[PDB]
Write a protein that binds this DNA or RNA. Sequence first.
DNA 1: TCTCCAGGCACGTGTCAGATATATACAT
DNA 2: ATGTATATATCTGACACGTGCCTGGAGAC
Lengths: 94, 248, 104, 52
Amino acid sequence: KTRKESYAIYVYKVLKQVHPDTGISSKAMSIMNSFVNDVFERIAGEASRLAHYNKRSTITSREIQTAVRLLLPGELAKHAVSEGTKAVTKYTSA
Amino acid sequence: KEYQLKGLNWLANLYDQGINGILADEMGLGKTVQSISVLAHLAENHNIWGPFLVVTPASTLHNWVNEISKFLPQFKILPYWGNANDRKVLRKFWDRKNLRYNKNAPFHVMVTSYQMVVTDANYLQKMKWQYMILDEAQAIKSSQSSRWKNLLSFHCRNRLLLTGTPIQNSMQELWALLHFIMPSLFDSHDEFNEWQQLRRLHMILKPFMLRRVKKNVQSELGDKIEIDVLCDLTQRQAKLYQVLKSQI
Amino acid sequence: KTRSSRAGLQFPVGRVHRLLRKGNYAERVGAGAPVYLAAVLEYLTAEILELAGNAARDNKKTRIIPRHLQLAVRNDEELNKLLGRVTIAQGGVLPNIQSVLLPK
Amino acid sequence: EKRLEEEKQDTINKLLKKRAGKSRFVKPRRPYNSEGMTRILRRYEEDLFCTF
DNA sequence: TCTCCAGGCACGTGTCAGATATATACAT
DNA sequence: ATGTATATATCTGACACGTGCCTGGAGAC
């Protein structure tokens, strides 16, 4: 059959990791699949325009860093830039 | 190959008279082979291979299937048990849309259970039947059962019953089985209750039941004796009675 | 040996890199940008999965219905501004009755 | 020819499903284990002492 | 850009939650 | 006269795990 692309198992077992005794339904998997590619194209576009506004021809951590510091209203960005910097330091550590 | 051939001839006689009958005999003489002999005799008489419903509990469903396989393998046997996918597959399998009698039909022998009849009330209200046989009829002793109301709503008008002992409760169940035999005659239980008690009760049910006892053949079955063993409680089993009666 | 395990993250990093290559955003892509995307994505779904969890134990249900995420997303102003313009299928209305509209 | 083949495949699948829904010792010894363990054998004609 | 292998997708089987039923003595 | 209480007994019904596979993410230049 067709090889459909969906991150439903990823959200399913971070749900299982943080909530070990909680269930879920297939409409929920479709609904935050719509969430995560909605924000994926939204912030992929944002950085794109921005970098092009900056006249840079690439996408490193800097453009997306200012995009996620600028885009969403608050709080989640304050934890998000810290946890993303911590993620790229465990990447460069490895 | 017994007296039960003449018994099913009497059953065919009361079928010709047009009144449905009740077999009130205990299990042990093989009523299943006599039921399929009734089926084969009616198929030899009036040439019917079509609608034949068998209502049977899930413990005896495969037993009925095996008996009708090894004894009379002429017909086509269709079961009814499984999941919803098998349910719609078998719903496709008996699409019919051809009443009366058919020869090249897949619904020759149809076996099902009480719970799957009960859960398909909106589905089984269609495809009006010509013959139902219900085996082990101790579960329809009450008229408050939903299965009893679902089997009342059918459009077959043929109510031959198989059971081991229909005399479980002789207050309401006899009126219920007489109502299932003929719904036109019996509908109110007050006239049954109002209309010397021990003598007059035998003559009410006299022309319907047959009189057969287990002790009429060669008793090589074992002659089952009853040995009752009576014992005393232990001290662990003694004080628990006073424990359970202490809080009351 | 997977790069997501090397980054210590759970959301995949090769999948978003694949979607970034043929997603036609930039002709050149850095290494840390898909990791940063996976990090902010993991943070966003971690936050609303906590919100859906406390809505689920508020309603005492083992399965998160989308209505649970409606009253999880309408209980904070940050996602009331981030997802205020959005329209949700089978979302309902949060309980909100004006004091003047109530009798007496 | 496609409709007849599809009908034949559906009839074969239905017949197989109907057939499946209608019609379908000595205990092992204890594991003897002995590594790095001196062995004494005692037979009818000879005896052994395998040491280390 | 060459290589290559196992991560995730797809398709089966068991295993705890609802539904009817018996049932008989006690309390209202 | 009737609810009921609390355990049955069947008995389905929706849900999570054990095998294939193939292809794309990772190592190297």
